[PDB]
Structures are given as C-alpha cells and as structure tokens.
Ligand binder design. Structure first.
Ligand SMILES: Nc1ncnc2c1ncn2[C@@H]1O[C@H](COP(=O)(O)OP(=O)(O)OP(O)(O)=S)[C@@H](O)[C@H]1O
Ligand SMILES: [Mg+2]
Ligand SMILES: [Zn+2]
Ligand SMILES: [Zn+2]
Ligand SMILES: [Zn+2]
Lengths: 47, 140, 402, 291
C-alpha cells in the first residue's frame, strides 16, 4: 500500500492506488466518455 | 540568509531562508549546499558520506568492478576513438594519452605495496493557495 | 526469465484493455516513470512496423514501445502529450506516434521501440568525440522541436535515448512539454518578464526583509521539468518562458559528461538549486541574472568555498571535479577522463606522432567543447544562443558528411 | 506527523481529508447515511455538492460556506473529521477556512478559469458548520464540554447594541508623534513601555488613541432555551450568545433560531477596582452559525 499521491482526475489525494481506482468518483469519471473526448479524436484519426 | 524577492514588490518573495547561527555549525551538514567536490561520479554537493574510498575494503571493490567493467569500456573506446561519427569505424588498435596521476589499478598496487606481507511520490500535487492565514501560522 | 511481480502488471494490462489481446504481445517492461510505465511489445499484425519503417532503428529485429500513461493523469495532459507527439512526425529523432488506444481511463501510446543505453552507464567512458556526437544529436532533436515551436521542458539524459553503436538518438518524453505562445499578442518587453498582466515609498523598504504576514500572491509560472536541469529563468518564477531554457538543459548534460558526475545538481528546492548555481558561478552573476527578470537576489553571511567561484571558467570546475578524482584514484587505467584532465592542465597552468596530432585533435575538441558548454550555460535568456546557432558553432565541424 | 498539543488534530491530515471531502462529496452519500436510499434521484444528488457550492460562491463573491456537519459522517474519510470538528472547533474551523481558500484557488487554476486570482487570495473565507449533534440541551453540558461545538435551539429575547472589540491598538508618541500599531493577542494588547524610535526613548511617551484604533463588531444576544428534552422540575433557561463581525444584528427579538457555536467559559472579575477573578466561571456561546 506504499503507492500514494495526487490524482489529477479526481482532484483528491489517495493513500492507495488499488482503492482510488475503485472509488466512486474515479469510476464515475472513467465511465463518462465526455471527459475523454479530445483523445477520442486521435484514436481513429491515426486509424 | 538568502532572500530572493520581486523588486516591483508585485509578487511575494520566492526565497526567504533565515538560519540561526547554531544551525551554521556542524559543517558536515549545512542547511544550504556549500560546494563539495566528491569522487567516483558523486553529485559534487553530495560528499563521500560514510564512504572512505581510501579504505582497502572499498578499494578491492572499485578496482575489481573496474576489472569486470574493463572491456565494455575498451569496446566503447575502440568504437568512439578516431571519428565522432560511428559510420566510419572499421579501419594502432588502441592509443592512449600518457598520464602520471595514480589510479584504481595504481591504488591497488599501492595497497599491495603497503599491506600485503609488509609494513607501513506519484509526481503531481494539489494546487494550494499562497496566502497563509494568521491563525494557521499560529497553529504551527 | 521474467520476474514474477511483473506478470501481474502485464495480465492487468491484458485485462484492463479487452481488445489488446491480439495486435500486441507484450514481451517485457522497458522502462518505468513518474507519469507512465513503458512496455516492450511485439507487433502481432504489421501495420506500424510495415509503416513507419523510416523511423524504426534497424538494429536487430524491430519491436514497438507502448506507453501506458498512468491513470491519475488528467485527460487534457494526456491529450497534450499525444497531440504534440502527433503534430511532429516524419522525423527520425522524435519517436513519433505510430498508434494510440483509449479504453476507459487507460491510454496507450504506441511509438517505435528505440534500442538505447542509459546515460549513467556510458557517461564516464564516452570519448570527447562521442560527447560531440551525443550533443550533436541532442541539438538536432532540440532544433526540430524548437522549429516546431514548443518547449520540451523535460530535456534530460533519460528523455534522450541514444544508441552508441548506431550512434544516434531520439527525444521520447513530452508529457510535460509546454507549448510556447507568441511574444506579443531589445530587452524592453520580452523580459521585464511582464506576463499575467500584473505589470500595469515612505516608511517601508521591502529590500532588507520580508513581511511577517504576507498579503501578496506568489507568482504562478510553469515549473514542470526535472530536478537539476531547470534553467535559471525557470528557477526564479518567470512568465514569458521560451525555448531557450531547453538549451540550458543541453549544457548540464554536456557538463555531466565533462567531469564524470551524472547527478550534476541535487536541486532539493528551487532555492537549493539556485544556491547550487551560486557555488559554480558566484553570487554576483546570479543577482545580475535575477535583475533581468525584474527580481532581486540577496545572500550574505554564507561560507562559500570560493567567492565568485570557478571564475576562470567551468574549465576549472571540471578540473577540480577531476582533481579530487585524480588524487584519490577514482578513475580506471583505461580512462578517457585523463585526456580532459591533461587538457585542463593546459588551459589552467596549475615515429608515433598520431600521439601528437590526435593530441591536437582531442585538445581542439575540448577547447571548442568548453566554448559550447559556456554558450549553453548563460544567465541571459535572449543573449543565450539558440539551437541553430549552437549547431553552427565550429565544435560540430563533422556535419559536412550530410 | 506534528499533531497539535492538547488535540487529536493534525494540520496536514485534516487538510487532506477535508479537501478530499470537498472534491468528492455527493448528497447521495447522506441519503444513504440517513437510510433514505429510495429518495436518491440521479439528477441533483449525483453532482459534486460542495464543488457547485464553491463555484456559486466564487461567482456571487460571497465568503461564507455553510457546511452541514452531518455530511462529514456520510463520507468515509471524514468520519473522524466530524469528531475532531465537534471536539476542537477552533483548530478544525481554521484548517477548514484555509482548505476552502486552497480549494477555490485550485478550482480557478486547475480548470484554467478567467477569474482574477488577486481578489480570491486576499479574501478571507469562512466555514459555518451548523448541523452538529443535537442533544444535551444547554444545562446538561458539563465543564468537559467547554470549547466544544454545540447546537442550541431557542427564542431571541434581546440584543445589545454593537460593541466595539479592539483588534489593533493605535498608540501615538506625546513627544515625536511616532505611532506603532499593536495587534491584539488572545485578548491582551502589549502597551509599549518605550518609543521604538531610536531618536527618542521616552518611557511613558506613548498614549493610546481610542478613536484611531481598529475595531470589530461584537454583539450579545439573550436566548431562551427550548430543548427537545426537558428534565422534570426545571424552568426555562436563558443564555448569552456572542456574534462577531458579520452575524451582528442578524437575529432580532422574537426570532426562533437554531444556533451552532462554541460552548465557552470566561472568568468574571468580582470587582471593577481590583483584578481578582471569580473561581466560578461564566458560560456562554460564541456563535458560528445561525439557522
Ligand atoms: N520509444 C521508446 N523506446 C524505448 N524506451 C522508451 C521509449 N519511449 C520512452 N521510453 C522509456 O520510457 C522511460 C520513461 O518514460 P518517458 O517516455 O520518459 O515518460 P515519463 O514516464 O513521463 O518519464 P519522466 O517521468 O518524464 S523521466 C525511459 O526510461 C525511456 O527509456
Ligand atoms: Mg515524462
Ligand atoms: Zn481519480
Ligand atoms: Zn523573464
Ligand atoms: Zn517618540
């Protein structure tokens, strides 16, 4: 559980990576495709 | 002290370091980087701390590490000797510039001069405000 | 052969990306980082290997590097890195973007694998001509990046990947690469440092001391980069930053090779790194540098070993970094540093004639190397030389074979 | 490390926990807490609650955030912060004010908003916890409840006029007319015993200029307790509340108000001539929120 640091996505500091990624706010951010929009241009711009 | 500020006084001072005289004692560790040189690739400011490169116990390490590390450096030397561009490498074999400063090999030969059978976290951070309240400073 | 704890990481990358089971077979993990863990992978189906063949180094069989950007990175920062990797392709010294894939919060950047040696292994053994080839390739990459007009803030030995036997390299990281915007939407306006639009007495001084409870906001300027390679202009908070700072990051590496010390600056704090620059140069030089960005420097009562130290030049510096080394005995018998040491014993006074004219070769090389080293190590942003002029300097007189 | 002496409060840990609570709280957390999960509507109970509140306060220019204390019970990381705030309101509320300032600065900078940062930095932001645990009336509080965040409910009967509380004392030299401005420290102002000017060092030259000092608003409000639980045989009680610097004149006589504030005790001097305090302390409330 040594992994600890900031998260620019959730704007919250976590003491554990395996519990931040399964937290409520992080899952809500990941499931929302509107946040990952400009990258969506690149996935198929190259392909 | 060290004090870096804005002459326009428009921004808050960037550097405000104020050390008491007793903190200036114990020259082994200053609160600021006094230039040190060091050896064996050390960061100049970092010294040889708890490290005596003159200790034979250390010496049998660095020369021997140099023995296994010898021919990797020989290959690199022969590959980067004559031309900076490496596309004209293939062509007496090795040339060297003479020196007189003592060495790891010379040190180890000296230690056999002197000891052997003879005498002598994540990477990001939250965006914090710059102005600290008086109560928060008092709580410190 | 693979250690067991990396198997969980790769099976995580397989699980986290449902569609990556094919088209990519991960062989190893080439390198980890603060913002990403890069993974050595083979290409199951050949799009980006059959394409992009000019970019790949044909050193052995060709593989592909997929940069698994860490989850905590913001979408705008990931987009920034990927977009700037996108706009600069068709260049052999940039590691351009062959592919990209996003699933939920995980983004993979697939770029050509470039076989490279870490700096900390070959820095000490590099001959002066090898240092020259290193700096030439670095300056070519910086020249392309600066012509594109962005600041690759993090220029460091790790972020420039260089194969010795092929003898060329590529600039890989760009996560922290800021894009310069125009000077206007000869030291009157580029650097009174006016930016943030905040440029528009009796009883108090504000030069002999600082307010006890300060009611002023600190400047907010970009500090992205790496400890020990931050330029003076980024060490004292300065807006209107330019590509010039990356040139400084070229010198430090050039200073790392000459002296055989990789961690050139500890740089624990911005103040700590700035005082580290005071020891090699001098308090007055740093204060006159600060007076340019509109800021005032002040330090007293400090026991500096040499006031205005290393004034003869950085020459004397590397000579001391070599002195302690050549007295204790820290260099091997097959060392390359002894040539530089004997050349500084020239510059400071304190058959077989390939001996003599290779003597002249390496001495002329060292003499011009210190000239480029001091052009890189300049306090003034504007009067510092750019990448083009730095590449036109007569130290690099091996570009005729082009 | 480095917790505060006499408290469980650590500045770093409390700041981190409160910042995480502010950035990642939704009202569905409290709806789950109150066993009301079937009232949960995805439209307004799934937005970050305090992020929206911070944005509204930034747009409106206000400075006070009304924090529902029970919300801290909904969040897992602030389950201890609730008890720390109740037990040590002073330190925790100061840390919360600082954290609000950091949070708003982060909201402006990280999202790259157009809003000027000069007037945000110089603004003092305040937190008003109100919905703390409602029990124990007022007469059931023991001396162990001094300096704790309590919640009273009652009727406003009376309010004294605005009392000036000196924050900065302005002294002036009777000889050279040189003035220093002393700051109050825990209710004590250090009167200078010598002119700090190096030119004249007259001992008693300095005199306090009452009308040129800096004053703040203080008001005492007489409240009648209307507790939820009334022990047998007791009669209605009256207490004195203290409102400071923005809450003055916010309560008029006849108002039924629920007031959250710090349960304080002060020693009362027996006589106006000598400095002798009474061993029996007098209890009152420093108001931090009025509902
Ligand atoms: N194309 C590549 N081929 C081989 N190694 C690579 C390649 N691109 C990146 N790396 C390695 O990636 C490691 C670090 O990842 P980077 O691409 O530098 O990004 P990063 O994780 O942001 O790194 P920092 O934190 O800025 S050093 C280094 O050890 C590089 O050698
Ligand atoms: Mg990087
Ligand atoms: Zn997150
Ligand atoms: Zn500047
Ligand atoms: Zn006087």
């Amino acid at each position: 559980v040594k992994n600890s640091g900031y998260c620019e996505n959730c704007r919250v500091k976590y003491e554990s990576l395996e519990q931040h990624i399964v937290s409520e706010k992080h899952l809500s951010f990941a499931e929302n495709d509107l946040n990952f929009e400009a990258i969506d241009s690149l996935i198929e711009n190259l392909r | 002290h060290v004090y870096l500020y804005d002459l326009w006084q428009t921004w808050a001072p960037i550097i405000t370091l104020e050390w008491k005289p007793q903190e200036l004692t114990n020259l082994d560790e200053l609160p600021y980087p006094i230039l040190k040189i060091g050896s064996f690739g050390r960061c100049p400011f970092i010294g040889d701390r708890n490290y005596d490169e003159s200790s034979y116990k250390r010496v049998v390490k660095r020369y021997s590490r140099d023995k296994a590390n010898k021919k990797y450096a020989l290959q690199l030397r022969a590959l980067f000797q004559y031309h900076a561009d490496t596309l004209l490498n293939t062509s007496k074999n090795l040339i060297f510039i003479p020196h007189t400063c003592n060495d790891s090999t010379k040190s180890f030969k000296k230690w056999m001069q002197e000891k052997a059978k003879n005498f002598e976290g994540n990477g990001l951070g939250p965006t914090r405000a710059s102005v600290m309240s008086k109560n928060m400073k008092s709580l410190s | 052969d693979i250690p067991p704890e990396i198997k969980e990481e790769m099976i995580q990358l397989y699980h986290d990306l449902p569609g990556i089971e094919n088209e990519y077979k991960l062989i190893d993990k080439i390198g980890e980082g603060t913002f990403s863990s890069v993974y050595k992978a083979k290409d199951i189906t050949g799009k980006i290997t059959k394409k992009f063949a000019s970019h790949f180094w044909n050193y052995g069989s060709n593989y592909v590097a997929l940069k698994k950007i860490y989850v905590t990175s913001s979408p705008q920062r990931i987009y920034n890195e990927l977009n700037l990797l996108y706009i600069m392709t068709g260049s052999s010294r940039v590691a351009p973007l062959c592919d990209a894939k996003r699933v939920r919060d995980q983004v993979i950047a697939v770029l050509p694998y470039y076989p490279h040696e870490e700096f900390r292994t070959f820095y000490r053994d590099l001959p002066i001509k090898g240092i020259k080839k290193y700096i030439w390739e670095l300056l070519r990459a910086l020249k392309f990046v600066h012509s594109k007009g962005i600041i690759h803030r993090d220029i460091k030995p790790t972020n420039f990947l260089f194969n010795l036997e092929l003898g060329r390299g590529v600039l890989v990281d760009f996560g922290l690469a800021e894009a310069q915007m125009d000077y206007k939407s000869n030291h009157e306006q580029f650097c009174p440092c006016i930016m943030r639009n905040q440029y528009s007495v009796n009883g108090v001084d504000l030069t002999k001391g600082y307010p006890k409870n300060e009611t002023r906001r600190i400047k907010r300027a970009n500090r992205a980069g790496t400890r020990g390679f931050r330029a003076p202009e980024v060490l004292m908070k300065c807006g209107a930053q330019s590509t010039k700072i990356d040139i400084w990051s070229v010198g430090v590496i050039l200073l790392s090779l000459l002296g055989r010390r990789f961690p050139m600056f500890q740089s624990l704090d911005d103040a700590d790194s700035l005082l580290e620059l005071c020891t090699i140069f001098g308090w007055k030089e740093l204060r006159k540098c600060a007076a340019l960005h509109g800021l005032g420097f002040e330090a007293s009562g400090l026991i500096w070993d040499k006031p205005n130290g290393y004034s003869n030049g950085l020459k004397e510096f590397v000579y001391d970094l070599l002195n302690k080394e050549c007295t204790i005995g820290t260099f091997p018998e097959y060392s390359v540093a002894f040539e530089t040491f004997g050349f500084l014993q020239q510059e400071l006074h304190d058959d077989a004639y390939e001996l003599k004219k290779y003597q002249e070769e390496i001495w002329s090389d060292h003499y011009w190397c210190f000239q480029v080293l001091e052009q890189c190590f300049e306090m003034d942003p504007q009067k510092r030389s750019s990448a083009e002029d730095l590449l036109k300097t007569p130290f690099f007189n091996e570009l005729n074979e082009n | 490390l480095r917790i505060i002496w006499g408290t469980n409060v650590s500045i770093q840990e409390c700041t981190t926990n409160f910042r995480n609570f502010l950035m990642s709280f939704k009202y569905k957390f409290r709806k789950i807490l109150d066993e009301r999960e079937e009232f949960i509507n995805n439209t307004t109970d799934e937005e970050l609650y305090y992020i929206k509140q911070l944005n509204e306060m930034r747009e409106l220019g206000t400075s006070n955030l009304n924090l529902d204390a029970r919300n801290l019970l909904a969040y897992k990381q602030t389950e201890d912060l609730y008890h720390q705030l109740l037990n040590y309101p002073q330190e925790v509320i100061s840390i919360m004010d600082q954290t609000i300032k950091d949070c708003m600065v982060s909201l402006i900078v990280d999202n790259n908003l157009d809003y000027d940062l000069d007037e945000i930095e110089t603004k003092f932001y305040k937190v008003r916890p109100y919905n703390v645990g409602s029990c124990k009336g007022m007469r059931e509080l023991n001396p162990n409840d001094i300096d704790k965040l309590i919640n009273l409910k009652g009727l406003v009967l009376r309010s004294t006029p605005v009392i000036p509380d000196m924050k900065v004392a302005f002294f002036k030299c009777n000889v050279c007319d040189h003035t220093m401005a002393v700051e109050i420290d825990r209710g004590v102002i250090q009167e200078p015993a010598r002119c700090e000017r190096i030119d004249c060092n007259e001992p008693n030259s300095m005199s306090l200029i009452h009308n040129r000092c800096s004053f703040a608003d203080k008001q005492v409000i007489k409240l009648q307790e209307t507790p939820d639980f009334v022990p047998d045989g007791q009669t209605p009680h009256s207490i004195s509340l203290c409102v400071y610097d923005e809450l003055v004149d916010s309560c008029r006589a006849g108002d039924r108000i629920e007031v959250t504030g710090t349960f304080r005790s002060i020693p009362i001097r027996a006589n106006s001539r000598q400095r002798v305090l009474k061993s029996l302390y007098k209890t009152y409330v420093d108001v931090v929120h009025v509902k």
